[PDB]
Amino acid sequence: HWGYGKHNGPEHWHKDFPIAKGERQSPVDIDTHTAKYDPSLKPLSVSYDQATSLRILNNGHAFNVEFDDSQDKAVLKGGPLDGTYRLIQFHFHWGSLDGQGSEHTVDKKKYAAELHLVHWNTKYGDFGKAVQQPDGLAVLGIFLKVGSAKPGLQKVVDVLDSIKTKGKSADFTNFDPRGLLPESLDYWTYPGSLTTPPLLECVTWIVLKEPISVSSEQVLKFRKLNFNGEGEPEELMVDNWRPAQPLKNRQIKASFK
Numbered sequence: 001h002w003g004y005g006k007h008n009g010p011e012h013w014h015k016d017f018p019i020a021k022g023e024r025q026s027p028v029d030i031d032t033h034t035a036k037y038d039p040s041l042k043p044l045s046v047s048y049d050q051a052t053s054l055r056i057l058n059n060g061h062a063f064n065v066e067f068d069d070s071q072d073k074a075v076l077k078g079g080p081l082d083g084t085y086r087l088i089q090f091h092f093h094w095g096s097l098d099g100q101g102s103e104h105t106v107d108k109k110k111y112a113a114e115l116h117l118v119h120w121n122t123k124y125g126d127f128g129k130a131v132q133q134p135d136g137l138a139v140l141g142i143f144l145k146v147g148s149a150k151p152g153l154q155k156v157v158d159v160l161d162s163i164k165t166k167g168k169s170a171d172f173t174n175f176d177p178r179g180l181l182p183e184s185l186d187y188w189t190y191p192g193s194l195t196t197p198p199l200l201e202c203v204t205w206i207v208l209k210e211p212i213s214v215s216s217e218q219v220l221k222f223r224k225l226n227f228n229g230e231g232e233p234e235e236l237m238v239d240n241w242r243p244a245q246p247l248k249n250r251q252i253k254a255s256f257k
């Protein structure tokens with residue numbers, strides 16, 4: 001099965017998922033000088049006041065904080081998007097070292113980690129239908145750098161001990177994802193894909209320019225998670241990122257000058 005090791009990592013994925021070599025794969029390097037300001041882009045609208053988190057799950061590749069997406073409760077709209085996208089889950093990708101971990105890069109710079117807030121287009125009814133459409137998902141990407149702690153992340157950090165291994169979940173209600181956002185909603189946007197198998201080409205990526213800062217102790221706790229299940233040999237969940245993929249026939253647009 002696919003993963004992030006030498007024998008099953010990103011360079012292998014194309015054998016089971018040929019779309020890995022497709023025309024709109026993610027992540028990509030964001031060349032800031034080549035991205036073009038698009039004055040017709042609208043401000044993002046991030047409406048998370050009614051978000052209902054439910055659970056946190058270690059799925060063997062990352063941990064997902066899952067939300068109730070059976071009503072319009074936490075939605076993303078505006079920006080490059082037409083229509084309304086509902087928050088279903090967020091997760092991160094991170095490194096074994098502070099100098100790597102992000103999936104997107106900015107002028108080839110790697111951040112310590114990257115948060116993905118995953119949303120699906122309500123016109124398709126459910127997430128499984130949405131991933132089969134070119135405009136099915138909108139993923140809000142936010143870079144993490146190591147410095148000061150992010151207080152709004154701490155409730156996530158502190159539950160990780162309870163979901164150390166693959167397949168473990170824990171109740172995780174009343175978590176407010178607004179505490180994970182930077183001040184500015186300036187962003188870059190481009191059409192892309194899921195960054196893990198099945199690598200479906202269904203995502204409008206919206207990547208915030210401003211990173212959030214997290215403490216070294218916060219990211220160290222991410223790195224204590226396990227890829228393996230309980231009672232299997234311990235493999236630390238680190239370096240669960242896909243490297244930048246060719247941009248091909250795409251233009252990255254900026255919301256800002």
Ligand SMILES: CC[C@H](C)CCC(=O)Nc1ccc(S(N)(=O)=O)cc1
Nearest residue numbers: 116118131139193194195196197198
């Ligand atoms: C049918 C599709 C898939 C098996 C269903 C499970 C799923 O949601 N996968 C997923 C979600 C988000 C990302 S990312 N890293 O934000 O692009 C990567 C993978």
Ligand SMILES: [Zn+2]
Nearest residue numbers: 091093116195
């Ligand atoms: Zn992701």
